[model samples]
Target: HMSIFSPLIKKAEDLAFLENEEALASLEIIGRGGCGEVFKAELPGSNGKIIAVKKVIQPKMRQIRSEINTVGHIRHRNLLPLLAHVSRPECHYLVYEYMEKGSLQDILTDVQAGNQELMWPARHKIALGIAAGLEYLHMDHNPRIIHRALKPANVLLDDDMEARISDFGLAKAMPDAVTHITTSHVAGTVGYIAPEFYQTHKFTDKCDIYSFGVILGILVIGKLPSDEFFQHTDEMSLIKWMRNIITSENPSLAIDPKLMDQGFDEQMLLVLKIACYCTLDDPKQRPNSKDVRTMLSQI
Candidate 1:
């Protein structure tokens, strides 16, 4: 039998071979988060082609393995590509194609300089791109996938300013339509988690729809819904609040300031109106991601 220390010994044995060749030469550290650190690296003798290397700190081996498996099976133009991976004693590495444009939060929260570039047309395209990515995740593939976590940070922009959904670590394949199963872990960002997930430990495709609706609200209004929107206070009460602002004659008061200059199109306005419906407190009332895509496409 292999010794209990075999893995550690193997890692140490490979360390010199892995580090000496300078595969990571000229690698610039780009970003760091709770789970991993990203580096911008240039391919030597390849005309300086850039790649983003994500090195995950020691994480649950199961979680790491799951991400590798999920990414391997799925393919989409809007999703980030997993080029390569490395496993060592200390951590795991995931190499992906680098995106020049940063997160949506960076653009919106630019206190130094206001976000003047995000006009109505641009905003509309972003909305469509997000829906497209979600649609691809749910219906375009053989096994429908649900992104348990869908938020602004998870939306990435490529060189062409097109949007893509990143981080499929939390993605799960859905079972038959009649039988919906939910995970008890309840792992998701607080504001984005579907209310049904809190109660039923079971997440269906509708849960992803709910999160998408929340993102739609944020993208259009440039503001998060009030905490009371999620509180179990009263489902109808929150729905009424959303209707009031969205249905108002003058929506500028609730709309994103950056998009105010451009004249609003009735078709697009109707799309935002539908966003309110999707965000309803009742999960059953929410539309599926496929429905959400079809409605947005009409605009």
Candidate 2:
């Protein structure tokens, strides 16, 4: 029972679901992230409300809070909603809105033979949702937020399978959205990281643009960064192969065969081109988040 700035849980009695620690046994393990393990708990008090709980079994520290503080009071439909923080001496629990469908990778991983039936419309929906979240962080917010780690694992899907960007605060907290944050240690999957970050260990909104670019492929191809396909073709880089697809052939060759029949050809190609530009060797060549949204929304 603590601070809950979300409309979903408005009353103190609503949090009575967690009052019985004896029920902690009932909290099912959801997934694990870099910092801690996550669990899903159903609220016994509020008409079977479901909430996600993250437990960091470590001593009190500001790192978790710093991440929470970034999105604590912030509200956005496409961003993971942080419900509340539960703390004890060495254990900390972060509660959030339970995404019924789980992360994008969850669905993709469960899809056998890499045949995740992530429909183009769903991918289209997810892409724009992510772009919208990035746009909000890059432009609309007071202190511009940079989601350094933007990947399928970080995109949570609601019951309807809509995308919600999660874990933005995983990187060092940015005091201001101005000049680059001193973050050489920030860890992001290689494919998602902009080529610039490795050289300088520095980040900018462009790096996010770069990440969104790689994720664009994930949506179209229905493969993870770890997929063997990426390793097979184009040797070391997915971007290079993506660039090749758009340039060499009709680009439909790279698309998940199941998706081509849905008549999303034009729009898919358009987004692929955008994704290619996003991972451009020169960071300056990437499209702005605002423009990314405009292109996706219209298509």
Candidate 3:
């Protein structure tokens, strides 16, 4: 048992030594990604709470600090909460509330397995939830935060199948004086990377919007930007492929067959058009995150 006011686990940064290291080792390995490997673990004592622990392998101090600062202070229903973190000499462990249903990617996989489709209403709610989370990060926070990486894999689902945004390792905070920031190195997933990032290496909240647009396409078409079907040529990026299909005589070709079969063709088309608007070639033409939330909410 642990005392309530124990110095070991007082602040969010405090690395409370796990009394039962063997217990942590026994937990199930749930996920692995660029940042780290996640395991399902339980806290110490009788009232132990289950959590998802991310053990950052070869952790970068800057990104770890950024994630700590970004998610540590902010709280939103659509955003994943950081319960606590352990800073060790070799690696850092981040404890988060366990999400039972896993990620949107997992759900998509189940759909492909003929298990179940996400359905129109749930998908719509998820799209809006993502937009809301982005809006919060862009506008609601003190120093506006830009999620450089926004993908289906980063979107986790709760027990009720609601969406929550996770993974802030690549997030950047914009100073009050600056409208945007220039990065010497471009950081993001290959296909979801904005067009301008290649030339300028500069990013803004709109870049996140662009990534969200790609996610929108994925949600609609049931295909990832990295899917083998879209790898015909280097030039045939998901954005370009979607643009080509949107402009074709049969624009319906862009919608997912499952969604189309669900008999929400009109609504699905409208959402696809919204996605197209978000992925416009010109960044200035894209809607702000707030506007995106509004548009998604209306749908």
Model 3 steric clash pairs: none
Q: Looking at model 3, report the run of 10 residues with the lowest lDDT sum.
A: 176-185
Model 1, CA-based lDDT: 0.60
Q: How many clashing residue pairs, candidate 2? A: 0
Clashes of each: 2, 0, 0
lDDT of 3 by residue, 136-254 (tens): 99999987877766778779988777789886644332222122222212222466667886666666788888989988887887877766778885446778888777778898887
Decreasing TM-score order of the candidates: 2, 3, 1
lDDT of each: 0.60, 0.73, 0.71
Off by over 4 Å in 1: 1-29, 57-67, 171-189, 201-203, 224-243, 265-268
| lDDT digits (tens) for residues 69-183 of candidate 1 | 5565566766665655566666666656667777665565452166435656666677788888788888887767777657666677787777777655442322322222222
Worst 10 residues of 1 by lDDT: 1-10
What is the Cα-based TM-score of model 1?
Answer: 0.72
| Higher-ranked by TM-score: 1 or 2 | 2
Candidate 3 CA-lDDT value? 0.71
Pairing residues by index, what is the TM-score of model 2? 0.81
lDDT score for residue 141 of model 3: 90
Off by over 4 Å in 3: 1-25, 46-48, 58-67, 170-189, 233-235
Clashing pairs in 1: 182-202, 182-203
lDDT of 2 by residue, 1-299 (tens): 25566665455554555545676667788885444568787765568888787765552246656556667877888988776766555565677778778788787777645644567888888998999889999999887888876778789988776789876644543323222322212322567767776566667899899989988987777666656677787555677877887897577887867678888888888888888888898988778999989988877
